[PDB]
C-alpha cells in the first residue's frame, strides 16, 4: 500500500499531503 494519487499518481509520504493534493484536482490553486 501507499499514498498515491489515482488522479495523476503523485505519491506522498504524508496522507494529508495527498488529500490536500487531490484538492488540486478539483478546486485548490
Ligand atoms: Zn494527482
UniProtKB/Swiss-Prot annotation:
It is found in: Nucleus. A zinc finger (C2H2-type) spans 3-25. Changing residue 8 to Y: Suppresses activity. Disulfide bonds: none annotated. Required for transcriptional activation of glucose-repressible alcohol dehydrogenase (ADH2). The chain holds residues 102 to 130 of 1323 of the full protein. Changing residue 13 to V: Lowers activity. It comes from Saccharomyces cerevisiae (strain ATCC 204508 / S288c). This is Regulatory protein ADR1. Signal peptide: none annotated.
Amino acid at each position: 500500500r501507499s499514498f498515491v494519487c489515482e488522479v495523476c499518481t503523485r505519491a506522498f509520504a504524508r496522507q494529508e499531503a495527498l488529500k490536500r493534493h487531490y484538492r488540486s484536482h478539483t478546486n485548490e490553486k
